[PDB]
Every structure is written in structure tokens, then in C-alpha cells.
Design a binder for this molecule. Structure first.
Ligand SMILES: *[C@@H]1O[C@H](CO[C@H]2O[C@@H](C)[C@@H](O)[C@@H](O)[C@@H]2O)[C@@H](O[C@@H]2O[C@H](CO)[C@@H](O[C@@H]3O[C@H](CO[C@H]4O[C@H](CO)[C@@H](O)[C@H](O)[C@@H]4O[C@@H]4O[C@H](CO)[C@@H](O)[C@H](O)[C@H]4NC(C)=O)[C@@H](O)[C@H](O[C@H]4O[C@H](CO)[C@@H](O)[C@H](O)[C@@H]4O[C@@H]4O[C@H](CO)[C@@H](O)[C@H](O)[C@H]4NC(C)=O)[C@@H]3O)[C@H](O)[C@H]2NC(C)=O)[C@H](O)[C@H]1NC(C)=O
Ligand SMILES: *[C@@H]1O[C@H](CO[C@H]2O[C@@H](C)[C@@H](O)[C@@H](O)[C@@H]2O)[C@@H](O[C@@H]2O[C@H](CO)[C@@H](O[C@@H]3O[C@H](CO[C@H]4O[C@H](CO)[C@@H](O)[C@H](O)[C@@H]4O[C@@H]4O[C@H](CO)[C@@H](O)[C@H](O)[C@H]4NC(C)=O)[C@@H](O)[C@H](O[C@H]4O[C@H](CO)[C@@H](O)[C@H](O)[C@@H]4O[C@@H]4O[C@H](CO)[C@@H](O)[C@H](O)[C@H]4NC(C)=O)[C@@H]3O)[C@H](O)[C@H]2NC(C)=O)[C@H](O)[C@H]1NC(C)=O
Ligand SMILES: *[C@@H]1O[C@H](CO)[C@@H](O[C@@H]2O[C@H](CO)[C@@H](O)[C@H](O[C@H]3O[C@H](CO)[C@@H](O)[C@H](O)[C@@H]3O)[C@H]2NC(C)=O)[C@H](O)[C@H]1NC(C)=O
Ligand SMILES: *[C@@H]1O[C@H](CO)[C@@H](O[C@H]2O[C@H](CO)[C@@H](O)[C@H](O)[C@H]2NC(C)=O)[C@H](O)[C@H]1NC(C)=O
Ligand SMILES: *[C@@H]1O[C@H](CO)[C@@H](O[C@H]2O[C@H](CO)[C@@H](O)[C@H](O)[C@@H]2O)[C@H](O)[C@H]1NC(C)=O
Ligand SMILES: *[C@@H]1O[C@H](CO)[C@@H](O)[C@H](O)[C@H]1NC(C)=O
Ligand SMILES: *[C@@H]1O[C@H](CO)[C@@H](O)[C@H](O)[C@H]1NC(C)=O
Ligand SMILES: [Zn+2]
Ligand SMILES: [Zn+2]
Ligand SMILES: [Zn+2]
Lengths: 209, 242, 215
């Protein structure tokens, strides 16, 4: 009748940290209880590889089955733009289904990163906003976090990337903190991970005065 | 009354015919059709209602609908033991695939290609609200319909008339105990896997003088005459001492 | 053998700015796609809180790249009605549908909350570039409908970009607007303004300024 296939990229953060293991994920849904084994062949720039890890079928709440195959991708392969192809074969499919995926293409560009303190006008509230402006980057894949005194700060939100007028992307990240903590002189830092920074990361600090 | 297309639920503009086994009563009033067959050539919203024919027949409730998909059943009220035919019917007999049948909001069957579904011997677990869904150019979902499956008789319990550590030479009656809920039932008594007394309308069985070798595990089966509802009791442990 | 299915309908609200300036004319837009060669004709009925109105403008069917038609109907809505939460219902009839399709749209529900508007000057580290970024932070607002622009000396500035609204942890929204200007203009002391239009401001409009201080 027709299983469907979906092919997912790795998490940007997994691709920008050499300590992590980025993965491509091939998901096949609407497999029937009757259908025989769902078979996976995987290719890297058109050359077959045999190190994919395919999971057992798992019955979903709707009584159909779902099958996932995961292929680890190497740091320099993903960032150099290699293409990953998942090929799904099964009796319920008249022809095998192929999906391809790779890093967004185009010349990388390095973001600049600027920390902006809260406005004087906001300093009447119980909490204040610390802002991190990340602009001029391409492609749009990126991760932003905040830390202070060696530990993640959790109360933040980051806009999506927005196309600027020169074809690059920008975003802003907002960390909300108690006013007291800002005035007492604590140092906060915005850490940005992006392909084109040296070693795919930078960190900028922000503190009173 | 019987129906060509069996389905008591039909789309607007489709054909259905009622045969009577003459006068036709729709919603309690009389109509023209004298024929032993009633012809709805192109169903409309006024053809919905309670139909009866000529003593006189039980009602049949016919529903005319509009929608993308319509879950069709052959009737809405069943006794335990009866077959239930389901169909996920596409408007204008178009193609849907990857079809799902739902019972009480839980998908219970998936076909790659549209297909009807017949539950051959129903029972209380089949009681509930059914709908279907399917993929055409988009994923389309039918309204729910109520089906009713009524328990004919609960599963029997074997009851003994003297409690289990009992003495040689006693009378003990075994009773295969089940209440009908509106034909009569047929009963058979067993010891282990061995038959003590076969199919019979009597619900009791006597050991006139109990002996040591009557110690064992006793059970029973209650069956309708035609047997398409047949249910067994759990085993009761019975001991005779010297 | 033909797959079951007919047209689809999408019902779009007016542009935030049109709802917030009483001199503009906000519209709700009912778009029908996948109208077939077989069943080309399409009919619109429109309702405002369940009462049929008749002043909608229906454009002519246009054939798309995939050999189906697209048919659009526009209803002008009154400023106060939209902000006071009236519901606009578009009813689409066509022979390829088993029943008419009804879509309803209204302003998002929930207590409106006033945007807080703060201007932030460029980073010290940016001030070696030929161009600099003037930032306008807008937060605490509900619902998400908002419009932001920049002015200087009475005249509008065109070189800005604004993020979409983002759900904050308290259920309100925020965004940032960034205006790029020649550093020379920032250095010379020009006053720039970030103007915000939202329902929960008085007159639906506020304005905050930003300039390199004198002396
Ligand atoms: C039976 O159940 C199955 C699943 O279980 C369900 O349980 C119930 C209770 C309920 O909760 C459901 O929501 C559960 O999923 C059903 O499986 C689903 O089937 C549908 C389609 O039939 C799949 O839909 C696709 O979804 C992807 C997005 O998927 C990610 O995000 C989802 C949440 O938003 C998430 O749930 C998914 O799991 C998945 O998460 C990702 O997972 C990976 C690895 O596993 C992680 O790495 C990611 O981090 C993670 N992300 C997050 C977030 O968690 C969506 O992309 C697909 O849309 C594209 O394709 C459509 C074609 O069908 C098309 O219509 C769309 O417009 C879109 O098209 C694309 O457009 C872009 C451009 O914008 C192009 O780039 C693309 O090329 C183009 N696509 C093309 C050309 O094909 C699609 O919506 C769903 O993912 C799947 N869920 C799971 C889980 O497997 C099953 O359907 C159901 N069967 C029946 C018969 O009812
Ligand atoms: C044949 O051709 C047609 C035209 O083809 C176009 O496609 C591309 C590939 C290219 O060919 C172009 O040249 C063609 O124009 C196809 O028509 C398209 O059909 C798809 C659906 O298949 C439509 O998809 C919907 O789009 C809306 C958003 O549309 C706005 O933004 C678009 C850009 O993203 C823009 O192109 C549109 O014109 C539209 O613009 C808006 O227009 C209004 C009125 O003029 C303006 O006022 C607005 O400012 C303007 N906005 C912008 C931006 O410019 C999207 O919202 C829809 O998503 C909903 O529904 C999805 C179901 O399909 C669902 O997956 C989503 O999650 C979402 O669901 C909704 O969620 C909300 C919660 O927020 C709920 O409230 C809703 O109830 C819920 N609805 C659900 C679940 O159903 C959807 O993606 C597309 O708009 C349409 N294009 C045009 C043009 O009409 C046609 O499909 C194709 N057919 C075939 C068989 O090939
Ligand atoms: C016999 O009786 C049935 C009802 O038991 C009649 O069916 C109903 O009658 C008319 C058809 O013309 C409809 O008004 C009605 O459907 C209404 O329901 C919806 C909401 O549920 C409403 O919004 C519609 O506007 C619509 O008017 C019919 N269906 C049902 C199930 O009630 C039937 O006409 C009778 N026929 C004769 C010959 O007497
Ligand atoms: C058996 O199924 C019926 C029908 O699905 C269930 O009744 C529901 O029945 C009615 C028709 O939809 C509604 O009036 C009710 O919401 C609901 N029943 C009650 C009593 O509230 C019923 O729950 C099922 N019961 C058993 C014992 O099997
Ligand atoms: C009612 O009948 C159903 C269907 O026959 C019974 O379901 C059993 O049978 C299936 C095979 O279809 C098998 O997987 C399991 O043994 C199911 O339980 C069901 O037992 C019965 N239910 C009751 C309450 O009597
Ligand atoms: C059904 O009868 C009533 C009027 O008595 C009305 O709803 C309608 O005109 C009729 N519809 C059809 C299709 O005959
Ligand atoms: C539906 O399928 C059943 C089971 O295969 C079969 O007997 C019949 O051809 C179909 N029934 C109807 C009523 O069309
Ligand atoms: Zn690296
Ligand atoms: Zn037996
Ligand atoms: Zn006011």
C-alpha cells in the first residue's frame, strides 16, 4: 500500500563539537504487521557503507509499525558537504524509495557576536534582559547557550535565524535574570557555535561596568 | 426486511433496496410502494428513518450521510455470537489506501489496500463506537457509528451442593450455573478432560454415592442449541475422603 | 482508481498593521486551492458572528502550475470588530466537496498585555565597522500581532529587519528589531526612533528613541 520515508539531518550542535557523534536518521512509517523486513542500504557520495544501525520494528499506537535506521556521520564529512542517501526496500513498495540529505550549501560566513546590556529603562523591573546579537552568519545552522560562573543559565530564549539584506543570517538571544544578580556584578557569557567560527565556537561576556 | 447493499448507512445519491419477507411503514406512516421490494434509486436526506413492512416486521433504522468516508455496518445491535461486517466506504467509490479501523478511539486494524472487515463471532469486547480513516489525496476520517453487542449468557460457574472436603457415600449435586438474558441452553459435565454427561437441557448432575475415586477437578459447558455461543466454567476442586 | 479528494481552504487574518491603524483597511482572505477542471465553479458565503454579510470581493479563478485553479475571496473587516474579537466565517461550496467547508477566524484569545519597548545602542566592539546596529527589544506582549518600524527626523528608515515574535516562558511574546545605519550617522548624534503598534498600547502606538549622548 505504501510505507513512507523521512530522512533527518544531524543536530547542529552534534556537528560543531568534535566530542559529539552526529547522526543521520532514516525513518519509515506505515509499515504493516504483515510486511516483511524493511531493508536499508546507505550511501555516502554514492559509495555504499555498511555501518548503519537499524532498529527493530516498533508497533505504534495506531497499530502500524515504525522502523528507524541510524548512520553515524564523520565531522569533516558532514562539514565538507558529503551527501547521505538512504534506500528503503520492501515488498509493500513497488520500487525502492531513495532520500538524500547534506549540509546546506553556499560559502560559509563567520558570525560576529555582540553582547548588549539591559536598557536603563528596564532597571526598574525585578528582572532584566541580557541580549546576545549574532549577525552575519551563513548557513543558518547554529546553536546559542548562556553560562555564568561555570554553569548553564536556563532562563533564555533565542529567536530563529532571520535573513538579513546581504544574504547572511542574524539572530538575537535573550537571557532573563534577577535584577539583583546583574547589579551585584556577575559575569554572564553568550556562547555561540557555528561552522565558520574558528573551531566552530566563540564566547562573549557581559557584566555591569 | 433485508437490504441489497446490506449497509444500514449509505451515502447521499447511492442506491439501496429493501426486501420484505405488502405495505411499507417509514417513521410510522404508510407509503405507496405495494411491491415486496422498496427502491431508493438515489438516497436523499428524507430516506433516513425507521422502516417496517407487512404480521409485521421489526424496525430497521436507515441513515443517509454526506462525507469523504463512511463506516458501514450491517446492523447496529447484535447478540453475542453473531458476525459483524464492517466496510470503510469512499465517496463515489474513489480510492483510499493505508486504511485504519478504530474501536472506541483505538486503531485495531491496518490494510495497505482498502478492504472490508468481518468479525465472525462477536462478543462484549466488540461493543463500542467504530470509525475508519484512509489516505486519498489527503488523510480522510469517517464519523463514528455505535455498534451494540449484548451478552446472551455469562460464563457458567460450576457449583457443588456440599463443600469440598466431603465424605464417602454422600449425595452431591453439581450445578452448571448461568442466567440467560433473553430458545434454551444445553449443558455438559466433565471431570478432568473426561466426559461425565453429554449435551442435555438439565443443568444438574448427581453423584448418588460419592467414592474416593470421584476426587478430581470438575467443570461444565453451557451452549446454545445451535452452539455459536459456547462457554466453559473454571474447574472446581472436589475431594471425597474415606 | 482515482484517489478520493477535493479542494482545500485556508483562511488568513489581516496584517497586524492594518488592524492597528484606523486609517487602513484590514481584510480577511479565503483561499481555495485544488479546484479541478471537472468542477471549476466555487461559491463563497461569509458570516460575521454567524450573520451573513454580502460585501466580500471575489477575484477570478487563476490556473496554477499544477493544472488546478486557485480562487480567492476578500472580506474587509471593521477596525473595532476585529480588535473586539468578532468571528469571521468563510463557507466554500463546490461540487467536488461532499459538504461545504467552513473555516472561522478571529483575533487570538486571552488577556491583552502591553509591550515593553527598550532601545539598545550598538556594542562597543561593533564601533570599528563601517555600519552599526541599533536594537529595539519588545517584550511582554500578548497577543503576538505586532508591527515595528524605525524613523529619524520625521522620515522612515528602510534598512531594518525584525525577528518574528517568540513565545517567552510566561506565555507572553518578545522580538527584536535591528536597524543598520552608517556609523557616521550614529556618531553625529542623530536621534533614531523605534515605533511599535500593538493592541494593548493606548492608541495602539508607542515610540522610543535612541541616540549617542552629547558632549
Ligand atoms: C501512525 O503513527 C505514526 C507516528 O506516531 C504518532 O503517534 C500519535 C499518537 C501522534 O502523536 C503522532 O503525532 C505521532 O507521530 C505516524 O508517523 C508519522 O507520520 C507522519 C506522516 O504520515 C510524519 O510526518 C512527517 O513529519 C516530519 C517531521 O517529523 C519530525 O518532527 C515531528 C514533530 O513535529 C516528530 O513527531 C517526528 O518524530 C520527527 O521528529 C524528528 O525525529 C528525528 C529522528 O527520529 C530527530 O532527529 C529530530 O530531532 C526530530 N524533530 C523533533 C522536532 O522532534 C515532517 O518533516 C514531514 O513533513 C514534510 O513532508 C510531508 C510529506 O508527508 C509534507 O506534507 C510536509 O509539508 C513536509 O514537506 C517537506 O517540506 C520541506 C520544506 O519545508 C522539504 O524539505 C521536504 O522535502 C518536504 N517533504 C517531502 C518533499 O517529502 C511529515 O509531516 C511523522 O513524522 C511520523 N511520526 C513519527 C514519530 O514517525 C503515522 O503517520 C501514523 N500512520 C497513520 C496511517 O495514521
Ligand atoms: C498546486 O498549486 C498550488 C500553488 O502552488 C504553490 O506551491 C509552491 C511549491 C510553488 O509552486 C508556488 O508557485 C505555488 O504558489 C498549491 O497551493 C498551495 O497549497 C498548500 C497546501 O497544499 C498551501 O499550504 C498552506 O499555506 C499556508 C500559508 O500560506 C501563506 O504563506 C505561504 C508561504 O508560506 C504563501 O505562499 C501563501 O500565499 C500564503 O500567503 C499568505 O497570503 C495571505 C492572503 O493573501 C496574506 O495575507 C499573508 O500575509 C500571506 N503570508 C505570507 C507568509 O506571504 C499554511 O498556513 C498552511 O499550513 C496549515 O495547514 C497545513 C495543512 O496543509 C498544516 O500542515 C500546517 O501546520 C498549518 O496548519 C494550520 O495550523 C494553524 C495553527 O497556526 C491552524 O489554525 C489551522 O487550522 C491548521 N490547518 C490545518 C492543520 O489544516 C499550508 O501550509 C499553500 O498556501 C498554497 N499556495 C497558494 C499560493 O495558494 C497546491 O497545493 C498545489 N496542489 C497540488 C496537489 O500540487
Ligand atoms: C423520517 O425521520 C427522519 C428523522 O428520524 C427524518 O430525517 C431528518 O429530516 C430532515 C430531512 O429533510 C432533516 O432536517 C434532518 O437532518 C437535519 O439535521 C442536521 C443536524 O443534525 C441539521 O443541521 C440539518 O439542517 C438537517 O435539517 C434529517 N435526518 C435526521 C437523522 O434527523 C426524515 O426526513 C423522515 N422522513 C419522512 C419521509 O418522514
Ligand atoms: C456498549 O456500547 C455502547 C454503544 O457504543 C456504549 O454506550 C455509549 O452508548 C451510547 C451511544 O453512543 C451513549 O448514550 C453513551 O455515551 C454510552 N453509554 C452510557 C451507558 O453512557 C456503552 O458504554 C457500552 N457498554 C457496555 C457495558 O459494554
Ligand atoms: C471475543 O472474541 C475475540 C475475537 O475472536 C477474542 O479475541 C481473542 O482471539 C484473538 C484472535 O482473533 C487472539 O489473539 C486472542 O486469544 C484474543 O483474546 C476474545 O477473546 C473474545 N473476548 C471475550 C471477552 O470473550
Ligand atoms: C424532504 O422533505 C422536506 C419538506 O417536506 C424538505 O426538507 C425537502 O424539500 C425534501 N428534500 C428532498 C431531497 O426531497
Ligand atoms: C467484503 O469482503 C467480504 C470478506 O472478503 C466478502 O465476503 C464480500 O465480497 C464483501 N462484502 C460486501 C457486502 O460487499
Ligand atoms: Zn571541526
Ligand atoms: Zn469444550
Ligand atoms: Zn487607553
Amino acid at each position: 500500500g505504501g510505507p513512507s520515508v523521512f530522512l533527518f539531518p544531524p543536530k547542529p550542535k552534534d556537528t560543531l563539537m568534535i566530542s559529539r557523534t552526529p547522526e543521520v536518521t532514516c525513518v519509515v512509517v506505515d509499515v504493516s504487521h504483515e510486511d516483511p523486513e524493511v531493508k536499508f542500504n546507505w550511501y555516502v557520495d554514492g559509495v555504499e557503507v555498511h555501518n548503519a544501525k537499524t532498529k527493530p520494528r516498533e508497533e505504534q499506537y495506531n497499530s502500524t509499525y515504525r522502523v528507524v535506521s541510524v548512520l553515524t556521520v564523520l565531522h569533516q564529512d558532514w562539514l565538507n558537504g558529503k551527501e547521505y542517501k538512504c534506500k528503503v526496500s520492501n515488498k509493500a513498495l513497488p520500487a525502492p524509495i531513495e532520500k538524500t540529505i547534506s549540509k546546506a550549501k553556499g560559502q560559509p560566513r563567520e558570525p560576529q557576536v555582540y553582547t548588549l546590556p539591559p536598557s536603563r529603562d528596564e532597571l526598574t523591573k525585578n528582572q532584566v534582559s541580557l541580549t546576545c546579537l549574532v549577525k552575519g552568519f551563513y548557513p543558518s545552522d547554529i546553536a546559542v547557550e548562556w553560562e555564568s560562573n561555570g554553569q548553564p543559565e536556563n532562563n533564555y530564549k533565542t529567536t530563529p535565524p532571520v535573513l538579513d539584506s546581504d544574504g547572511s543570517f542574524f539572530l538575537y538571544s535573550k537571557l532573563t535574570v534577577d535584577k539583583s544578580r546583574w547589579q551585584q556584578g556577575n559575569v554572564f557569557s553568550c556562547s555561540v557555535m557555528h561552522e565558520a567560527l574558528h573551531n566552530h565556537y566563540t564566547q562573549k561576556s557581559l557584566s555591569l561596568s | 426486511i433485508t437490504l441489497q447493499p446490506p449497509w444500514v448507512s449509505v451515502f447521499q445519491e447511492e442506491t439501496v433496496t429493501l426486501h420484505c419477507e405488502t405495505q411499507w411503514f417509514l417513521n410510522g406512516t404508510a407509503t405507496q410502494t405495494s411491491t415486496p421490494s422498496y427502491r431508493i434509486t438515489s438516497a436523499s436526506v428524507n430516506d433516513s428513518g425507521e422502516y417496517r413492512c407487512q404480521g409485521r416486521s421489526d424496525p430497521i433504522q436507515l441513515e443517509i450521510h454526506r462525507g469523504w468516508l463512511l463506516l458501514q455496518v450491517s446492523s447496529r445491535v447484535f447478540t453475542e455470537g453473531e458476525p459483524l461486517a464492517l466496510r470503510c466506504h469512499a465517496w463515489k467509490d474513489k480510492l483510499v489506501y493505508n486504511v485504519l479501523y478504530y474501536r472506541n478511539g483505538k486503531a485495531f486494524k491496518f490494510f495497505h489496500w482498502n478492504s472490508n472487515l468481518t468479525i465472525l463471532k462477536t462478543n462484549i469486547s466488540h461493543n463500542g463506537t467504530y470509525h475508519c480513516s484512509g489516505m486519498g489525496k489527503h488523510r480522510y476520517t469517517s464519523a463514528g457509528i455505535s455498534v451494540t453487542v449484548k451478552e446472551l449468557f455469562p460464563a457458567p460457574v460450576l457449583n457443588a451442593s456440599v463443600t469440598s472436603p466431603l465424605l464417602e457415600g454422600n449425595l452431591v449435586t453439581l450445578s452448571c450455573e448461568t442466567k440467560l438474558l433473553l430458545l434454551q441452553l444445553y449443558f455438559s459435565f466433565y471431570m478432568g478432560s473426561k466426559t461425565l454427561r453429554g449435551r442435555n437441557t438439565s443443568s444438574e448432575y448427581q453423584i448418588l454415592t460419592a467414592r474416593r475415586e470421584d476426587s478430581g477437578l470438575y467443570w461444565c459447558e453451557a451452549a446454545t442449541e445451535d452452539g455459536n455461543v459456547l462457554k466453559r466454567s473454571p474447574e472446581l476442586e472436589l475431594q471425597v475422603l474415606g
